[PDB]
């Protein structure tokens, strides 16, 4: 079952024949994507007795949102006996295809809730965003503040990280780390990547399982707050740093400059693996060590954990 392979055929889009349409967006006045914040998209509709297997309807989802969040592939929930199975198209919209249930049922009505997440590429910056979703002529709008908040900082050591592209079938994940986003001077900077202490974590961190790329940021303004990163905007300095794997499930990166200090941010993109023989918990700790001008040794660390949500969908009807 792959989201890269779709199937079509007989049937007609009966979106505009949906009766009793209501749409809603459940969220707070503020959404914090990096604190596992999300919204709920709610939908209700009556289906025409006229409907037959293969007829489709379209739920319009805005580019400011995606449905996959921290995982790499979105699963839209089936409306339930299965009334309708759904799929995500190239625009991000959800096309549902009605089953056989509707070939012999009448007065059919349904409900749907889908978790949705602020998309990092389309909402790169903190700020208000009007979210719009709908079905046919019925659109709902909700204007919300998207707040990506702030990196962590202790003395002259700044760091934050994000996790996405969690793929529980190929056993991989991505982690994107901003090192020194404060634009501090740091001397003898060292980054270590670990499992989060005393927490169930199934990351395998080592030279075979963990691909690390390091980008130098010559213009901090180019950094998104969402942690979307396109490597083409920055300088790839992977080959000039020291990357090693000094302890079980730990990596270490020394920036190793000629004057043994950094004055700019660095982005570290970690493409790693999950332990196939496990529940696949992901709890990580990223630690930035460094001296200040006074040569007192300090570290700041950032923890990454994740949450998972499921939508639902129910439908009733009567034998004709």
């Amino acid at each position, epitope marked *: 079952g792959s989201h890269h392979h779709h199937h079509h055929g007989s049937g007609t889009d009966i979106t505009n024949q949906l009766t009793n349409v209501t749409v809603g967006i459940d969220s707070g006045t503020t959404v914090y994507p990096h604190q596992a914040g999300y919204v709920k998209l709610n939908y209700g509709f009556s289906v025409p007795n006229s409907a037959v297997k293969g007829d489709t309807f379209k739920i319009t989802v805005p580019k400011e949102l995606n449905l996959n969040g921290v995982t790499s592939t979105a699963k839209v929930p089936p409306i339930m006996q299965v009334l309708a199975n759904g799929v995500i198209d190239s625009d991000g919209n959800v096309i549902y295809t009605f089953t056989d249930y509707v070939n012999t049922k009448c007065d059919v009505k349904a409900t749907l809730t889908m978790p949705a997440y602020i998309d990092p590429e389309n909402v790169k910056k903190t700020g208000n965003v009007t979210l719009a979703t709908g079905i046919g002529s019925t659109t709902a709008n909700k204007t919300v503040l998207v707040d990506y908040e702030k990196y962590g900082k202790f003395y002259n050591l700044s760091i934050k990280g994000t996790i996405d592209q969690i793929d529980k079938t190929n056993n991989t994940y991505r982690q994107t780390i901003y090192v020194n986003p404060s634009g501090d001077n740091v001397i*003898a900077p060292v980054l270590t990547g670990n499992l989060k202490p005393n927490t169930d974590s199934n990351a395998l961190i080592d*030279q*075979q399982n963990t691909s690390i790329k390091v980008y130098k940021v010559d213009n901090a303004a180019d950094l998104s707050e969402s942690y979307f990163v396109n490597p083409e905007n920055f300088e790839d300095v992977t080959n000039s740093v*020291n990357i*090693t794997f000094p*302890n079980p499930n730990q990596y270490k990166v020394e920036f*190793n400059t*000629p004057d043994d200090q950094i004055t700019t941010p660095y982005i570290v993109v970690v493409n790693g693996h999950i332990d196939p023989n496990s529940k696949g918990d992901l709890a990580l700790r990223s630690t930035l060590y460094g001296y200040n001008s006074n*040569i007192i*040794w300090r570290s700041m660390s950032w923890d990454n954990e994740v949450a998972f949500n499921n939508g639902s969908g129910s439908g009733d009807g009567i034998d004709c």
Partner: antibody
Amino acid sequence: QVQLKESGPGLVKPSQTLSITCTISGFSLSRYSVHWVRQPPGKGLEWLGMIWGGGNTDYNSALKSRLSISKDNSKNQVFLKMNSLTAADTAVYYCARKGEFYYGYDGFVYWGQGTLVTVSS
Amino acid sequence: DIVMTQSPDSLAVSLGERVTMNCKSSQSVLYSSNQKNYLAWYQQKPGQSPKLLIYWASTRESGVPDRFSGSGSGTDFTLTISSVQAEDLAVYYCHQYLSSYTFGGGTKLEIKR
């Protein structure tokens, strides 16, 4: 010029603690990590552990329970301590330090002359 | 633990000839992201500390003679002496530094007669 010299006892009983000192010159200990590595008579080399400039230590997993590494930047001294000794800990003990940044890694470029410790009753 | 094994324990050499030594690792020491092989070779004489000859598999250390070269990639590596001299009689150890620090059991050169 960067230098390292190991001093210690020559002989140590198995009831006792091994205590070695590495005296450092030509660089600041707070800016460089120093390694410990050992070599039994007629055998190969074994990394024991390291102390970072900032004071963190990493140990060889097989000896961490019996091993402690510490230092005094003030005095240019690095210390190695080992308890629960057997004849297998009779070895030449070395301290060592990496090359300058352009080497691209933290390894063993500058070595001390080493100091033989033999465990015996 | 990446384990390092050197194939010929002892090697009989003719002063002037081409000596090659093998070293093998139980897992790859080529990290795919930077394409570097985290491998070094050391020389040791009987009462002295080891001396770095070669690092990153093929980068000759300053001061080391041009007759020494290193090759290989991944899990198989070689130390060559173009033509062996009196001072080359010693022990040679390989070593990896990608996953902590480990050494091979070494290869002793002796004179053939």
